[PDB]
Design an enzyme around this catalytic site. Sequence first.
Site, PDB file in Angstrom:
ATOM      1  N   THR A 278       0.827  -1.204   0.000  1.00 31.46           N
ATOM      2  CA  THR A 278       0.000   0.000   0.000  1.00 31.46           C
ATOM      3  C   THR A 278       0.861   1.254   0.000  1.00 31.46           C
ATOM      4  O   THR A 278       2.061   1.176   0.218  1.00 31.46           O
ATOM      5  CB  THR A 278      -0.979   0.035   1.204  1.00 31.46           C
ATOM      6  OG1 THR A 278      -0.254  -0.024   2.441  1.00 31.46           O
ATOM      7  CG2 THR A 278      -1.971  -1.138   1.113  1.00 31.46           C
ATOM      8  N   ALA A 279       0.229   2.400  -0.245  1.00 28.93           N
ATOM      9  CA  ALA A 279       0.938   3.667  -0.435  1.00 28.93           C
ATOM     10  C   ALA A 279       0.739   4.603   0.747  1.00 28.93           C
ATOM     11  O   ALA A 279      -0.028   4.308   1.669  1.00 28.93           O
ATOM     12  CB  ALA A 279       0.470   4.342  -1.728  1.00 28.93           C
ATOM     13  N   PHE A 280       1.418   5.745   0.713  1.00 32.66           N
ATOM     14  CA  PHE A 280       1.390   6.637   1.864  1.00 32.66           C
ATOM     15  C   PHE A 280       0.061   7.363   2.020  1.00 32.66           C
ATOM     16  O   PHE A 280      -0.301   7.740   3.126  1.00 32.66           O
ATOM     17  CB  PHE A 280       2.519   7.678   1.773  1.00 32.66           C
ATOM     18  CG  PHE A 280       2.254   8.776   0.766  1.00 32.66           C
ATOM     19  CD1 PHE A 280       2.599   8.613  -0.567  1.00 32.66           C
ATOM     20  CD2 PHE A 280       1.640   9.961   1.153  1.00 32.66           C
ATOM     21  CE1 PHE A 280       2.351   9.621  -1.492  1.00 32.66           C
ATOM     22  CE2 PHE A 280       1.388  10.966   0.239  1.00 32.66           C
ATOM     23  CZ  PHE A 280       1.747  10.798  -1.088  1.00 32.66           C
TER      24      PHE A 280
ATOM     25  N   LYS B  73       2.939  -5.108   3.430  1.00 34.51           N
ATOM     26  CA  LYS B  73       4.080  -4.189   3.454  1.00 34.51           C
ATOM     27  C   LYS B  73       3.568  -2.803   3.092  1.00 34.51           C
ATOM     28  O   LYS B  73       3.198  -2.556   1.944  1.00 34.51           O
ATOM     29  CB  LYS B  73       5.187  -4.609   2.475  1.00 34.51           C
ATOM     30  CG  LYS B  73       6.413  -3.678   2.507  1.00 34.51           C
ATOM     31  CD  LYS B  73       7.068  -3.547   1.116  1.00 34.51           C
ATOM     32  CE  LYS B  73       6.627  -2.278   0.382  1.00 34.51           C
ATOM     33  NZ  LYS B  73       7.078  -0.993   1.051  1.00 34.51           N
TER      34      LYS B  73
ATOM     35  N   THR C  78       9.986  -6.028  -3.625  1.00 34.64           N
ATOM     36  CA  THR C  78      10.428  -6.805  -4.768  1.00 34.64           C
ATOM     37  C   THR C  78      10.364  -8.293  -4.452  1.00 34.64           C
ATOM     38  O   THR C  78       9.988  -9.096  -5.306  1.00 34.64           O
ATOM     39  CB  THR C  78      11.849  -6.394  -5.187  1.00 34.64           C
ATOM     40  OG1 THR C  78      11.815  -5.023  -5.594  1.00 34.64           O
ATOM     41  CG2 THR C  78      12.356  -7.253  -6.347  1.00 34.64           C
TER      42      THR C  78
ATOM     43  N   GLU D 223      -3.572  -1.085  -8.552  1.00 34.99           N
ATOM     44  CA  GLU D 223      -4.306   0.171  -8.481  1.00 34.99           C
ATOM     45  C   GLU D 223      -3.294   1.269  -8.706  1.00 34.99           C
ATOM     46  O   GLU D 223      -2.525   1.610  -7.807  1.00 34.99           O
ATOM     47  CB  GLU D 223      -5.026   0.329  -7.130  1.00 34.99           C
TER      48      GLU D 223
ATOM     49  N   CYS E  49      -5.393   9.890  -4.945  1.00 33.23           N
ATOM     50  CA  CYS E  49      -5.278   9.238  -6.245  1.00 33.23           C
ATOM     51  C   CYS E  49      -6.271   9.861  -7.212  1.00 33.23           C
ATOM     52  O   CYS E  49      -6.048   9.868  -8.426  1.00 33.23           O
ATOM     53  CB  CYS E  49      -5.514   7.731  -6.123  1.00 33.23           C
ATOM     54  SG  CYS E  49      -4.241   6.911  -5.139  1.00 33.23           S
ATOM     55  N   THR E  50      -7.352  10.401  -6.651  1.00 28.56           N
ATOM     56  CA  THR E  50      -8.414  11.030  -7.424  1.00 28.56           C
ATOM     57  C   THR E  50      -8.327  12.562  -7.493  1.00 28.56           C
ATOM     58  O   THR E  50      -9.280  13.212  -7.910  1.00 28.56           O
ATOM     59  CB  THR E  50      -9.777  10.669  -6.844  1.00 28.56           C
ATOM     60  OG1 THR E  50      -9.805  11.053  -5.464  1.00 28.56           O
ATOM     61  CG2 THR E  50     -10.017   9.168  -6.956  1.00 28.56           C
TER      62      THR E  50
ATOM     63  N   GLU F 154       2.128  13.206 -13.118  1.00 30.55           N
ATOM     64  CA  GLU F 154       1.346  13.221 -11.887  1.00 30.55           C
ATOM     65  C   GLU F 154       2.199  13.627 -10.689  1.00 30.55           C
ATOM     66  O   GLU F 154       2.778  12.778 -10.013  1.00 30.55           O
ATOM     67  CB  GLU F 154       0.709  11.852 -11.639  1.00 30.55           C
TER      68      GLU F 154
END
Lengths: 474, 474, 474, 474
Positions: free
Chosen positions: D162-164, D188, D229, D266, D300-301, D397
Amino acid sequence: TLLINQPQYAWLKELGLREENEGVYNGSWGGRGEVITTYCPANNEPIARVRQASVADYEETVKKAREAWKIWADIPAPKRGEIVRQIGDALREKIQVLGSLVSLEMGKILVEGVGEVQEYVDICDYAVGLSRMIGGPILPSERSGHALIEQWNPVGLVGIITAFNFPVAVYGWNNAIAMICGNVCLWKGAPTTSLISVAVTKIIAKVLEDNKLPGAICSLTCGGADIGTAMAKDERVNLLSFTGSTQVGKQVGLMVQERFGRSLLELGGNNAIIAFEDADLSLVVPSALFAAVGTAGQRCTTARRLFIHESIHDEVVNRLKKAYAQIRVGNPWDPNVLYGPLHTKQAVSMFLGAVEEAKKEGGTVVYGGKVMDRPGNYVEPTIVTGLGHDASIAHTETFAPILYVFKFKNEEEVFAWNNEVKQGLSSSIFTKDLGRIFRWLGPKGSDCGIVNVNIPSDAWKQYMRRSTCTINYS
Amino acid sequence: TLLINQPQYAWLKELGLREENEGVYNGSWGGRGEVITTYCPANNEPIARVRQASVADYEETVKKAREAWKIWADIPAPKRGEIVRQIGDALREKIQVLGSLVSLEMGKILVEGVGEVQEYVDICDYAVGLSRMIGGPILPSERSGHALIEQWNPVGLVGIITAFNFPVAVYGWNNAIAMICGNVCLWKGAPTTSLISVAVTKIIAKVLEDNKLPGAICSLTCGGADIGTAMAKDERVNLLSFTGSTQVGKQVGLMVQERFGRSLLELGGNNAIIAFEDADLSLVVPSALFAAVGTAGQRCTTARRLFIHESIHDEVVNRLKKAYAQIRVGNPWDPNVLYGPLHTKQAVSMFLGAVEEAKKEGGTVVYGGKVMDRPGNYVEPTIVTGLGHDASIAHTETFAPILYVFKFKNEEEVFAWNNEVKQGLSSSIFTKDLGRIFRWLGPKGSDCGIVNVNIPSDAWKQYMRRSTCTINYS
Amino acid sequence: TLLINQPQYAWLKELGLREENEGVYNGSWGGRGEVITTYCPANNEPIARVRQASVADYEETVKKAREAWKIWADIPAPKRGEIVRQIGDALREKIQVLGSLVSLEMGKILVEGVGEVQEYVDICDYAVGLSRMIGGPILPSERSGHALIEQWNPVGLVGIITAFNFPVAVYGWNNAIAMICGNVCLWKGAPTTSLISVAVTKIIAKVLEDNKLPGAICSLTCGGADIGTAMAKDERVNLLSFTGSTQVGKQVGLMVQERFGRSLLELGGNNAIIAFEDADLSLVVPSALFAAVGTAGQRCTTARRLFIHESIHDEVVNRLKKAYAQIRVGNPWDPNVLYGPLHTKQAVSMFLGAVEEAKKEGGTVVYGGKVMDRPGNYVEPTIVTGLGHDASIAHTETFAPILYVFKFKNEEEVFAWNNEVKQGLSSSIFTKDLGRIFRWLGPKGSDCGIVNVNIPSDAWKQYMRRSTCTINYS
Amino acid sequence: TLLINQPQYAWLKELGLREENEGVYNGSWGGRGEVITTYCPANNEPIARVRQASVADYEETVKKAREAWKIWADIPAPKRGEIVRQIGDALREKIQVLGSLVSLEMGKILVEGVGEVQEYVDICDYAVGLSRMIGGPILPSERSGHALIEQWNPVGLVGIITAFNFPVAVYGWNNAIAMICGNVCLWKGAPTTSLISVAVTKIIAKVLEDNKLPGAICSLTCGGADIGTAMAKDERVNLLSFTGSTQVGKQVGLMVQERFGRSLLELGGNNAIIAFEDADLSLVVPSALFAAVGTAGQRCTTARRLFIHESIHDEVVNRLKKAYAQIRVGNPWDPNVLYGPLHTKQAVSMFLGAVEEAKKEGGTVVYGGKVMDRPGNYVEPTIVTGLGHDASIAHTETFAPILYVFKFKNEEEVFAWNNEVKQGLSSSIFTKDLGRIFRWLGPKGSDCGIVNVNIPSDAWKQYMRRSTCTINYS
């Protein structure tokens, strides 16, 4: 003399019809009950005769169908779907003559008779694919080592009672879906469309016999009230599908409920059209005309009440009058004709009664209102203005082309007026206001099963029975 | 004197109960009808009183509910789901005291009282998710520029009539699903479980009121058959859900059909267990015992008929007799009893009548059959052998622990007997034969809605009305 | 000289085939790429020639298809379904000659050639019904006045790459479902079945052209790996469906992912049969035989590994040897042969190489293993015993009738071996143990996509793109 | 000094956090890899330390998860749903402090941190009901005595990266749905939101341990690139769910494809808003503002491209400028604050780079464009006009609040401009033209997965594997 005995109607013999026909099929053809003559509504001439089921014929046919079911229910649904596909192909080969028979015996124009047969063909093509989608989920149990299964099985024998105005396609829908679901069927059609019932059954019988299947899978018992009532009261008829009048349907429903059976009831309705102040009159006028006079006002979806905003009321009535004047009348199997006869002499009497009563209730006939002076059951398509929304005659469903027209000022009252009607089958609004459209489609809008705007797949579950099966394998 | 006025029952006040309670809720509490006193079946002492609905109360409540619906139907389904979630949480907070009330007034053991409230909680948890899933497809039209929508709308007012034996969870299911579907509800519970109905309604009412919603969304009109009849005949009750006896349910069904309303009927059914020659007897015996005497034989699913293959019949009966002798019967708060009292004194008379009728019809009581000589409505778990499969008393559902035992030789034999009964609710077979299992669950097998093997999500559509909407946007 | 120029093959002209054929169709026929001659594997004689796509042809075709899509995507799904129905009918009319071509060019026996065309016909019949079912729900928004719609749209251009062994039906499935979903298609078939690709496209093209639709809706670009690579790398190919080898499929998958395209990969898998101690050997032996040698071992589902419990191993092998000796191999038009030639001379060399490698790895050829001394690509059905379960040649899928046989003792043992292979396509177990069956199909069982026991409808979503649309109409 | 060591931040200890925390959980807590310090973006102060996974920790955790799966996969889905329900309740109890941690470590304002935790709670409540809907149909076989079953099984181990920017709810969705489907998970998270990952895992771990379940069902391995990875390349990770940048996502996708694994990706998107000539500017302006500057443009949106009709371009920009000027800036955990810092120092450099480059490409900064002179990573929300649609910087972006504004004349060009963009995540149009709305939602409209108009349930199948099971019982 019988039409089928005249050389000009020798095409009837392509459907296997003769001067006197057996009206019972259960694998064998028979009929020991009353002999009925059906008539051509365009000229009141007798076409041919059908020997209907006796009570004993009905009894034997039910037993034979239930025996055939033992074989049929063991045939995999996709193979049953293949049989239904072949019925569709067989109808295809006869579409012109069968469509012509629909026009001849029922009275609807030729493009509609053919179109009704084509609808049955399209239903069979659809049923092929549907036959591969029958089944229920395996759901997760709350208990370990237990399987939870939603099981679907045929109900068994489906009795089908149909009406005069769609003498082919209503049966076709019920039969096709009931068959792929593993049921056997027993058909009692409208007595005045007996030849159509026999012709369709002959087509189906040949497919079944060519496939070495028992014919009673699609049984026929032509008959009147006593046969219909027998089906309603018969505990061996597991599901009774009825299409017809609301008063008869209620009694059928009560009889089936009394024996804890299952029923599917397709009953009448008043259909209304509502044209608001902002409506496209180029859509409204031709929509109303075809909805009002199509099949001479004998459709279940025929528009009989037209509510028009005060601002456009006069113009719409005038343009309707113009359009009505161009309607082309004649023999319904003549390809040039747009408007045929009513189905029976009795319908003509109802028509005359309704018109005079509308006058008596204070209505104004602005077009038509008369019987046409020609052989057959032809009446003028009629427009009646000046009645109040509450008018009793306007809420009686007279299967004749009488359009009752009402004026209204605002959205609130017209919606209230329509929501005061009970049997309402369909509702068509014409407006460009999007918010108003949402209101009419939503929870506070029309109570109708069919709602149309700017225009006039678990179906199979209705013909099966569900069980919840729990298997402990631990 | 009333139990609620005694110090050891002070916990009842945590449910908002008093000596005399209002049995009507429609946003406010009231009741101008007859008073009813309910009794604790463990000691036959009066608990408290409830003032039931008069006709005026019922009229006012139906009107307030239909007004409340105008607000409720406009609330988005997921937000309606959040209300139902909060009801689940409120039940959670009261689960011990509400479960104890179910035990006190209905008579089931505490683990079952608490467990019934837990089922309602689980239903609420389920409904939260379901509320985000209700709706229908946009389907392709055959005509360009036309949209075809399957629309689902609330039916309106959902009347809910429930029975004594599950006085919380049946209502809970109907209410939770009806609520997320945008309906308002009107509850009439069993008169002998009036306090339970009031206590549940007080919990729900508080959630509604706290959320500033009209309380009549979940209305309550306590009463007997005259309120039930009013509901069945009332056109303003769009859908009537009835749970109870087959005889009463038939009447309800007929009344609703007479007015073209909608009904959901959950009626009695007998429940049979069939043990084949190859059955695991160490499964059969405890399964039969617990299914037969659970909740003192008062469940809709209670096993009352046990069919045993000739080769194991004597052995299974002998082992059941030994096991029955170990059943502990007693007070619902005793953690070490398997079941408690029958719900009413009348049910005790019914038990005695059935036992005598069984003997007159030639049966042998091999265990039990007597009333226990203690305060309350306690009877011995009872086993009857020797009756013919068609014996009348064994086809009567007596809500008491009486198990009728039959011997059979063939699969064809026992199947015929079992599918000679009509009202059959569940069928449980014990066997290891996989072919037999498929036969039993397949089209030629059991006709029960519930079938079990080696053990004794479109539901929302039942509470909504479907329309087909066609929108011409070309 | 070419078979198509010989009088006994004049029937080929009924398929619109000639000595030299155009292998590109995009509304018009053409082909400026390399010529390819295809050969009849029954006699190794050249049939006819096809001119394949050049790069310019491929470019022009992709452009014409994307232009055709602007028209096609605007046609209502049920009307697209009617086109697919007409394709089914057109295939029907050609089924004997098209099935004979499949036999002539691919080499499978006539009943299978005809049967493959019948599968495409059945797919078309299925798709007609499916076309009326595609779409998504309108879901309740959590916000008042907001509508939440699950929208499904065509992905655009669907590239379809198919393999030699089912040169009609794999394309047929992809094409029919893609078409009803509003996509246009581009087909690149196996070069060695180019005539079959051209013949199928001529049938479809005629339906499209007769219906006044641009032919590029179902385009064809015959070619080898360079056309396949172009398709995999082409951003204008929105979805690439590939059927074939695992090694090639991996490359295709990587290329499509590199450009963020969509792919559907149907790659090789081995197929194992496992016979447990309690298996019915009269099922096991014929099942294994037909699964192993059907279509000369050239199906994706061909059984190549047979595991037998130690207690029945020798017996099953002995009975297989006896049965193998009765297999009749010969010309695809001979109604009395079980299978015909391998597709290519190269496949014969592969067969010989595998047989030798098997011996080098310690296996015993207990039947077959030789090339038949006759014209064409005929080999003996072959059985190999003695290999270790991990032997390399037995994990190689050789498209020829070679069955490798392994012995095992425990369930844990044979399961471990089988779920040590990765690419596994199907697993077929033979046993009567119900517990074992549930284990094998459950979460801890076989990982194959296809699992069979005692034998050897949202698909449309794969060809469309989903969007969530929120409309604020408040 | 560490924030967690200062008394004003002692509330952190309510989440079980200390000055140095274990970043690995597999039933035991550990971490032998690098020790990382995470920082508060509002003041650039260090909060606390986390000891990340070593490669050996990762290896052991994968093995422990796969062992735990043996237990978990045997637990019935509704009981797994109950565990997920309890996680939701546990999050509920910590919602304020966990939400505050999200604001403290990630930087989003408090109502959004709390709102993100609430989203996870809502997901758990939803998953409860979903857990009862998992399963496939039993379909009809074409062969008699054959059962055709669509079986769904867990994929096994689901790795979640997942992301920040949504450090709680993306994991929450993946975890909840993966759990009810019978999978185990390995998380993770973003290294810069490690404390949030640890806090969430502590909450989940306690529910699992209280239920006597192996903790590794929800494993945690905090780490950087090497751990990510490893997951992408690990054949034991059956499904890898990745949320993050398009460039990293492509490489993750390729690595998973290389080993024939499964992935859910995503990835980023440019989000555009299009305001036509007839748009409600009272909706447009506040919609654009919140879509552009919400979470400081790090969603993200997030809207980064605003297309405005020439006729209203100037007015909308002006009103945006006014609105931007009222934005309230400060510490994001202060309830009064509407606008927080960027997540990292590096983001500030990207912001500055993007602005200068937009200038260099010919753009005009009409508002903002500067770093704010205060501690932390605060930048001015920025509006850039004058760039051409093609401008390279406007298609990159940059996770910063820069809104690029474009003018257009007619529907054709603006639709063309937007359809030239690749990664496009969402598209929001503002217009009152209904026909135009249909065009944009239809096949020829936006290619985005999310489309909004006048505003800025087979999910479980993604986490399971399907098999077709055929059972012959005849």
